[PDB]
Design a binder for these strands. Structure first.
Ligand SMILES: [Mg+2]
Length: 476
RNA sequence: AUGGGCCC
RNA sequence: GGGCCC
């Protein structure tokens, strides 16, 4: 988006500047060029002459403004994709009762009780359980007024900025581009789920190529489904965006809300309204207070679904701007926020589509950086989705999600205080698809110290998950 | 460190 | 309550 006023207020918000990630026994062996993100502005590992506040907000390179013809095309693409969307899901997108938004429904999980509450609650020294009691599922006095203050449409707020204590490649760590988190107020998350929660739950359960969404998908079972679909098309593309969320232009966000969440399809009038509050946000970061126009806050309700919807609309908009006679039938795709896979039997020139994406403020790039161009003839066994490759299991011929060994080495090389044993359990379910030799090698530093599940136990569990008949048939 | 997922 | 993905 576009930063419009950086302000210095007397009050200051504290930011976590101490990594909980510590090296493990595996770090000494694997020597990964990965490390914890720089949280302090006086971090020794930073390259000299790098201010952390400067690098963080560098993702806002302006807010692209569209012409009326570009907006009328985007409005048609939003209306066409919304027609397909609400035709698969149905139009049962009525509001949600107050405690349905808290305890969830079929497809939508419950809210997290012990996560940061946002502003202005955090500035009092307040946990989230004080405002909303989650055991019963009711709100307290502060949220009482805000809920109906949102109904009045008077509700103003601000996003609390947070540093993401995660593992990053050492080039990004020394460059100081630590990723941030825009924490919205808890009452805003509650009210958003009331307006569009039933829509989100219906998307979760209906994920797949038909709606172009992979949100709420389980790669262990869903990759035989996705893999066989994209293996049916001549050309496959692995497109990468740069700052996909920050570069959503105001016009594209506003037009998408006006077309997807219409009261025609069953939503409440405030569904369009509450989503439009995300366009022009105020952000608090210690002394600073930053007003921004455009971009999506990375930390709000339905932020993955909104990004997934925009991603689907961007492809339809770009193709129609360059070619003639293009519909949703022309191509197939599936996305999970910025991550996207596209395919078509037509010979689509994606190099030619780069400027048409640039009119939306987005910059597309081939994930396979070699040659530095979108070539044709790639298959599903070339591309990556959700940090996993589509490889066919040699034993049962099913597609399985395989992660690169150096990605698993980075994951295994760091861990928080005493969370190692169950992290080894969780990661082993990911490492099983790298094969028996690679699985034993990834956990060799740990054996004799921790419990390591057998490759046999995890492979059998996966066979039953992808298809319980596959386990039974192998028995007869 | 958030929103939402998926596994335990 | 922990891990992983976006
Ligand atoms: Mg990608």
């Amino acid at each position: 988006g576009l930063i419009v006023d950086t302000r210095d207020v007397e009050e200051r918000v504290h930011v976590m500047r101490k990594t909980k990630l510590a090296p493990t026994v595996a770090h000494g062996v694997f020597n990964p060029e990965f490390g914890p993100a720089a949280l302090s502005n006086k971090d020794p590992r930073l390259n000299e002459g790098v201010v952390l506040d400067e690098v963080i907000f560098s993702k806002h390179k302006g807010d692209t403004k569209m012409s009326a013809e570009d907006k009328a095309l985007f409005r048609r693409c939003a209306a066409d994709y919304a027609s397909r969307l609400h035709s698969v899901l149905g139009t049962a997108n009525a509001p949600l009762s107050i405690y349905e938004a808290i305890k969830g429904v079929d497809g939508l999980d419950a809210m997290e009780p012990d996560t940061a509450p946002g502003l202005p609650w955090a500035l009092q020294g307040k946990r989230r359980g004080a405002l909303i009691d989650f055991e019963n599922g009711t709100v307290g006095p502060e949220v009482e007024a805000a809920l109906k203050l949102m109904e009045k449409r008077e509700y103003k707020f601000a996003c609390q900025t947070f540093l993401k204590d995660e593992i990053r490649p050492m080039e990004k760590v020394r460059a100081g581009k630590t990723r941030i988190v825009d924490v919205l107020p808890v009452e805003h998350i509650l009210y958003t789920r009331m307006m569009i929660g039933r829509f989100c739950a219906q998307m979760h359960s209906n994920n797949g190529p038909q709606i172009g969404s992979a949100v709420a998908a389980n790669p262990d079972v869903d990759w035989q489904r996705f893999g066989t679909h994209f293996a049916q098309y001549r050309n496959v593309w692995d497109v990468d965006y740069s700052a996909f969320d920050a570069n959503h232009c105001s016009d594209a966000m506003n037009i998408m809300f006006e077309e997807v969440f219409r009261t025609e399809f069953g939503f409440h009038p405030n569904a369009e309204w509450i989503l439009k509050t995300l366009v022009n946000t105020e952000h608090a970061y210690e002394n600073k207070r930053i007003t921004v126009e455009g971009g999506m806050p990375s930390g709000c309700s339905a932020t993955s679904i909104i990004n997934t919807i925009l991603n689907n609309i961007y492809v339809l908009y770009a193709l129609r701007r360059h070619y003639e006679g293009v519909e949703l039938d022309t191509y197939t795709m599936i996305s999970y926020g910025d991550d996207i896979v596209v395919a078509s039997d037509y010979d689509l020139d994606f190099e030619a589509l780069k400027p048409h994406f640039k009119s939306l403020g987005q910059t597309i790039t081939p994930a396979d950086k070699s040659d530095k161009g979108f070539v044709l003839g790639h298959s599903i066994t070339d591309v990556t989705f959700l940090k996993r490759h589509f490889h066919m299991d040699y034993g049962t011929g099913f597609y399985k999600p395989v992660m690169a060994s150096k990605t698993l080495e980075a994951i295994l090389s760091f861990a928080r205080r005493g969370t190692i044993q169950e992290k080894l359990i969780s990661v082993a379910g990911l490492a099983v698809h790298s094969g028996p030799d690679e699985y034993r090698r990834l956990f060799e530093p740990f054996q004799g110290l921790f419990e390591i599940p057998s490759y046999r136990s995890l492979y059998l569990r996966w066979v039953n998950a992808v298809c319980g008949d596959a386990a039974a048939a192998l028995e007869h």
